[PDB]
């Protein structure tokens, strides 16, 4: 019965090219081009306009009415998600100072509890445990509560700072508490931050990063405890909108790294933390050079271990520069390779560890420092951590590696049907000890599922890997329903890693597949930097289509049985493939989807735009205008049949503005020639990542699986058929 809302149109001309008074980049088209955008009014930067809120509410009513018939299936799947998590749970503990730190979840509570015990006691022992921050108490009375960081102050770890965002726009307030005096109110508040907290050398001061009015991180500051924030001193400002500011502490705690990064270019400065709480003088590592990226990990205070793409090192090389001449890049530790992509590096007192990829999969490599002098030597070489399985994902868990002299590192391992395990690993002999194994209940068993690697062929004949998982009892003699996932931007690879999100699909007799399309870095950095960005970006979409065509041509599924999903830049993928090949899919999920590509990317007042001129290109420029227009999902909506679609988004999302999916759903409904349903679920209480409250998050997830399973006619679990 329920009818979708009809969106009003208001004339609005969008300018792409030169606009007097705005920074549209160094070479904007003049005269500029104009485009009509009759749904432009859906945008309100203040998220308070009565007509905009009314329209979003009418979308919400329509979504609730069309979803009423899948309430029971949503409840079933939500119960499955609940059975696949642990009401009472503890993270993998790690040592920092005199303590082992960890989080707990407790039955019936939606948020985490940050805890510790002394290193001579058992994590989770109630008689030994100290609660640092109970996020459930922080979130009292609030609809949404993201506590991002909790950092005890050295040397005592008694004073604690924590960052909290109560709306989802990822602007955080830093607050404080004293563990040894839980009723002492500490007056200091630091507002307008990106949520990162880095203490100074002692408990008297800390560093933090603020955002401009387009939410770009642009300044690094020092706050001295007991002062007003208006007395804080700005240590660094990045005025160029392509670049964001960042900061982190060296692993031995002696140096703060502060700098700027844009997709093409990095610049790092060092701040010595050994010269008291008034030393604010920065030391440049290497002045910015367009197209040169680098990362600095200090080995003590004397040497910079630098991971960089300089001088054609597409897959990156590792070098060591002296503190005293940090732009002397002549000493190569590990040269570039065509097969090994080095993605990040953790340096500790007598070893380093590199996370990256080789032969399509994540790998870890280690290198010991020379035992005679403690120095890294090029003749030693990287030693790969050898892993037995053909398909898996491994991560280096630097957030659980705090002690600079700790003789192990923390690695987490999973696969599509194998729950995560966290190990302490020796970099000397690669021996390991499991610290935590994720328990998954509700009858889950890893041996119920078959995991495979298959290969699609794109138009240019490149082989596109797919990671596939399905239930062992699924009848593979005929085509079956299937869900095909992609992302494909920023060089973020999708990996065959464990998630409970595909269990309701595989347990109902669906195939779950990931398409490892160009735009990720799965086959090395070129898979992104050349495979799909700027004027090759269209490869993301045609690789995904080749993956879908592969699953159909191989008789794994059929278009009537095929779903596709993606979120954020994966929602750009969904919007483009929905215009290009809607005939391949019965149903689609587009989460928080980047779809308003021309109107958003011409406009530097929208968060993220200016930095993404170095991802897709800048449509104010002749070089990019036609090419971006050729795939922009909003601008290629047309009179054809589309699949059933569900779109999830957040009113406060600071990465993909709520108005992009609102305008896109309106245009789809206006132009489409089929009688399928398009549902827009706008969460007025969150940002880009749905609820941090775990029960709300799992209920939000369940509505999406229920909608796919309904439209695939695969609603009944295999076990109970």
């Amino acid at each position: 019965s329920a009818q979708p809302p009809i969106a009003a149109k208001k004339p609005h001309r969008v300018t792409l090219g030169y606009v007097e008074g705005e920074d549209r980049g160094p070479n904007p088209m003049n005269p500029p081009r104009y485009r009509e955008d009759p749904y432009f009014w859906m945008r309100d930067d203040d998220r308070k306009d009565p007509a905009v809120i009314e329209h979003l509410n009418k979308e919400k009513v329509y979504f609730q009415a069309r979803s009423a018939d899948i309430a029971q299936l949503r409840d079933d799947i939500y119960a499955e998600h609940i059975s696949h998590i642990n009401e009472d749970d503890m993270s993998a503990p790690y040592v920092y100072g005199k303590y082992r730190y960890y989080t707990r979840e407790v039955k019936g509570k939606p948020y985490k509890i940050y805890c510790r015990v002394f290193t001579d006691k058992e994590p989770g022992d109630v008689a030994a445990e100290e609660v640092i921050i109970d996020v459930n108490q922080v979130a009292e009375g609030k609809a949404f509560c993201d506590v991002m960081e909790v950092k005890p102050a050295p040397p005592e770890h008694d004073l604690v700072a924590f960052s909290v965002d109560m709306s989802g726009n990822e602007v955080y307030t830093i607050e404080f508490k004293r563990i040894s005096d839980p009723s002492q109110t500490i007056a200091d508040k630091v507002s307008g931050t990106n949520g990162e907290i880095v203490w100074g050398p002692d408990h008297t001061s800390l560093f933090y990063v603020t955002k401009d009015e387009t939410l770009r991180e642009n300044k690094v500051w020092r706050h001295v405890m007991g002062k007003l924030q208006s007395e804080d001193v700005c240590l660094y400002e990045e005025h160029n909108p392509l670049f964001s500011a960042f900061m982190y502490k060296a692993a031995d705690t002696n140096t703060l790294c502060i700098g700027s990064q844009s997709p093409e270019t990095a610049e790092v400065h060092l701040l010595d933390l050994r010269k008291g709480n008034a030393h604010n003088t920065l030391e440049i590592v290497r002045p910015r050079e367009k197209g040169v990226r680098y990362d600095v990990q200090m080995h003590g205070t004397s040497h910079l271990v630098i991971l960089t793409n300089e001088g054609g090192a597409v897959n990156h090389k590792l070098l060591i520069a002296p503190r005293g001449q940090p732009s002397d890049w002549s000493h190569v530790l590990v040269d570039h390779s065509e097969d090994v992509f080095m993605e990040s590096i953790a340096v500790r007192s007598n070893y380093l560890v590199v996370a990256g990829r080789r032969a399509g999969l994540t790998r870890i490599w280690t290198m010991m420092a020379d035992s005679q002098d403690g120095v890294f030597k090029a003749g030693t070489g990287l030693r790969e951590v050898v892993m037995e399985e053909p398909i898996f994902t491994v991560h280096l868990v630097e957030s659980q590696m705090l002690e600079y002299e700790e003789p192990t590192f923390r690695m987490e391992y999973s696969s599509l049907a194998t729950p995560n395990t966290w190990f302490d690993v020796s970099p000397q002999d690669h021996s390991r000890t499991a610290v935590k194994v994720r328990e998954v209940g509700g009858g889950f068993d890893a041996a119920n599922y078959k995991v495979e690697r298959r290969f699609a062929t794109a138009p240019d004949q490149t082989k596109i890997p797919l990671s596939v998982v399905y239930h062992k009892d699924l009848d593979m003699s005929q085509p079956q329903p299937c869900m095909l996932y992609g992302y494909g931007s920023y060089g973020l690879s999708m990996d065959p890693q464990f998630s409970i999100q595909h269990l309701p699909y595989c347990d109902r007799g669906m195939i779950f597949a990931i398409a490892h399309i160009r735009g990720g870095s799965e086959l090395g950095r070129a898979w992104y930097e050349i495979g799909a960005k700027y004027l090759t970006k269209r490869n993301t979409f045609s690789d995904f289509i080749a993956a879908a065509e592969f699953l159909v041509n191989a008789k794994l599924t059929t278009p009537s049985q095929l779903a596709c999903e993606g979120r954020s830049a994966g929602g750009l993928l969904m919007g483009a493939v929905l215009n290009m090949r809607p005939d391949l899919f019965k149903v689609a999920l587009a989460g928080v989807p980047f779809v308003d590509v021309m109107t958003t990317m011409c406009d530097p007042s929208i968060p993220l735009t200016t930095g993404e001129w170095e991802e897709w290109g800048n449509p104010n420029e002749y070089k990019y205008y036609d090419y971006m227009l050729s795939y922009s999902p909003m601008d290629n909506v047309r009179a054809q049949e589309y699949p059933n679609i569900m779109v999830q988004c957040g009113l406060h999302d600071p990465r993909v503005a709520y108005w992009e999916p609102a305008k896109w759903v309106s245009k789809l409904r206006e132009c489409k020639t089929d009688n399928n349903e398009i549902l827009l679920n706008i969460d007025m209480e969150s940002g880009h990542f749905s609820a941090k409250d775990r029960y709300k998050f799992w209920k939000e997830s369940a509505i999406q699986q229920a909608f796919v399973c309904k439209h695939l006619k695969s609603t009944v679990r295999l076990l109970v058929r």
Binding site: E217, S489, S568, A569, L572, V592, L608, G611, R655, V656
Partner: peptide
């Protein structure tokens, strides 16, 4: 990791 400022992505969509």
């Amino acid at each position: 990791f400022r992505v969509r």
